[PDB]
Every structure is written in structure tokens, then in C-alpha cells.
């Protein structure tokens, strides 16, 4: 039922928001799509709606957990400032992506309790893309990263978290 609802591009934006308001159906079918996101190790794997397709499957599986946005804001504001540097200010984020990897690593080194799984799945997804972004350009192939990371947070408000 959930796998047929979770279709290819935009299978059920209106449908998954009703089902996420569940336990056994989304613990498996979104786990395959979380594994499908990790199997797409290249960040530039989706010129089409598939960035908008992965992020709906990501933010539906994270909304099943907690995922407080307040915990992530140190990473989220850091992604805002590095994109602000790309506007003719700097061109090397490698001196600060390591900080953004460290702030991602410090956050899961803090997030302990019932909210481990809300940050373990969040740890699983961005880091194979941060592996690619180490040896990448920053005007291109980081443009597709930051737009993916917006759509994760954006649908997370629509599915009812934060």
C-alpha cells in the first residue's frame, strides 16, 4: 500500500501527508527509498524531478521520527552562509565543508535518547553527498546539493514536523 503510494516522481504529496498523520508500512517502503537515496551516491544523479522525488521520500521517513529543526539549524544556517560566499565572495568551501561535516558529526555526537534515529537517518543521507562535495566544484554540483537540502526541510514542514 505504502510502496504503491510512494511512486516514482510525485506519487502522493497529498497522500503521504495523511498516512504520516503509518508505523509498519513506512518503516519498510521508505527504508528502501532511503537505501535508494544512499545508492545514488553521486549528488548529480538527478537533473529531473528525482531530487524532488528523493526528498519527499526522505522527509516522509524523517517525519516518522522526530527531527527537530532546532537541532539542525547550526548546519542549516551554515549551508546558508556557504551559498552566500558563492556570490563572487569565495569559491572554496573545502575549508568549511569539513566544519559542516564536523557540525553534522557533532550533532549526532550530542543527539542521544529517543531522538537517535531521527539523526541517524539524517546522518545516513547527507554524508555520501558530502563525500562527493569534497572533490567537486562549488558553483556547480553544490547548486544541486543545496537545492536538495532545501526540499528536505521544506517538505518536512508540510508533513508536520519542526
Residues of the shown chain interacting with RNA in the complex, contacts defined by CB under 7 A:
68-71, 112-114, 162
User: What minimum distance in Å lies between the beta carbon of 14 and another protein?
Assistant: 21
DSSP 98-120: HHHHHHHHHHHTT--STTSHHHH
Q: Is 139 helix (H, G, I), strand (E, B) or coil?
A: coil
Of RNA, another protein, none, which one sits near residue 68, judging by CB under 5 to 8 A according to partner kind? RNA
User: What minimum distance in Å lies between the beta carbon of 110 and RNA?
Assistant: 10
> What's the CA gap between 138 and 95, in Å, rounded?
12
User: What minimum distance in Å lies between the beta carbon of 129 and another protein?
Assistant: 16
Of RNA, another protein, none, which one sits near residue 73, judging by CB under 5 to 8 A according to partner kind? another protein
* Cβ atoms 17, 11 nearer than 8 A: no
Amino acid at each position: 500500500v505504502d510502496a504503491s503510494r510512494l511512486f516514482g516522481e510525485s506519487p502522493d504529496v497529498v497522500g503521504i501527508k495523511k498516512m504520516l498523520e503509518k508505523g509498519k508500512q513506512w518503516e519498510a517502503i521508505q527504508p528502501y527509498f532511503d537505501n535508494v537515496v544512499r545508492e545514488a551516491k553521486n549528488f548529480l544523479e538527478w537533473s529531473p524531478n528525482k531530487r524532488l522525488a528523493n526528498a519527499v521520500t526522505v522527509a516522509a521517513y524523517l517525519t516518522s521520527q522526530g527531527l527537530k529543526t532546532n537541532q539542525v539549524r547550526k548546519i542549516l544556517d551554515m549551508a546558508r552562509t556557504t551559498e552566500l560566499k558563492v556570490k563572487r565572495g569565495e569559491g572554496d568551501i573545502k575549508d568549511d565543508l569539513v566544519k559542516m561535516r564536523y557540525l553534522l558529526a557533532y550533532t549526532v555526537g550530542k543527539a542521544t535518547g529517543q531522538s537517535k534515529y531521527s539523526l541517524d537517518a539524517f546522518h545516513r543521507i547527507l554524508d555520501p553527498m558530502l563525500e562527493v562535495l569534497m572533490g567537486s566544484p562549488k558553483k556547480e554540483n553544490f547548486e544541486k546539493f543545496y537545492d536538495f537540502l532545501q526540499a528536505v526541510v521544506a517538505y518536512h514542514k508540510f508533513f508536520g514536523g519542526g
